[PDB]
Amino acid sequence: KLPPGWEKRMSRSSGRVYYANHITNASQWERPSGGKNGQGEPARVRCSHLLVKHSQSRRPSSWRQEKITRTKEEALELINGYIQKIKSGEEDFESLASQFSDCSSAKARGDLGAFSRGQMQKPFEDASFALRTGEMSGPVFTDSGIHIILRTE
Template sequence: MSSPTQVRASHILLKHTGSRNPVDSYRNKQVTRSKQDAIDGIEQIKSQISSHEDFVRLAQEFSECRSAANGGDLGVFGRGQMQQQFEEAAFALQVGELSGLVDSDSGIHIILRLG
């Protein structure tokens, strides 16, 4: 099977003080948590996800990306459009699959592949 050239994915992002832009861009507030606290937070959020509806609700409540307004939905993107770690994880998922923790320059993510 050939690799897709585009995917559609949602994510939940928790930033930390070492993130490239440690500001919650959805709520416009400074992020002061450590990287370990971001990892712990994402693990706790992930443990609450048992459906797509849970993911959307938790993204709206906790994600520190502007995509939180859309339940974390980033839309369709191709290779080279996202940070490498994020892209590799998103393209490796099957449709409907939830990633493990993904560490990028932006922070700690979990990714749900939508298409």
């Protein structure tokens, strides 16, 4: 059972029986979905994302700040913060993307439109294609920085 990338695991804290995905870095208590060996994988998907860059990003510069100086570690803590606010409903994805994304797509609520296999950096692509419409990833790492991907179509 269990769709691509999903492994059962056991978290400290308690009898955290939970589910995690090694492609998307998503985690959750709930079992992923249903008896249909596949579903396949669309030729195309549509995703938004929120990018936080750091000093080791291939371009330490964004519309939000000319010289980015945060460390990969600091950026990772920020992603975790936003993921917390998002998962709790305090703030929504589009809102934090518009405000804090270091991608120019910030001004599109983070929307990147539809794409295929081949077009995006591979971990982003692998994660986007492992998500299902509606699902959000954990922190995803690329040469740009650290992403949160929301799959919209």
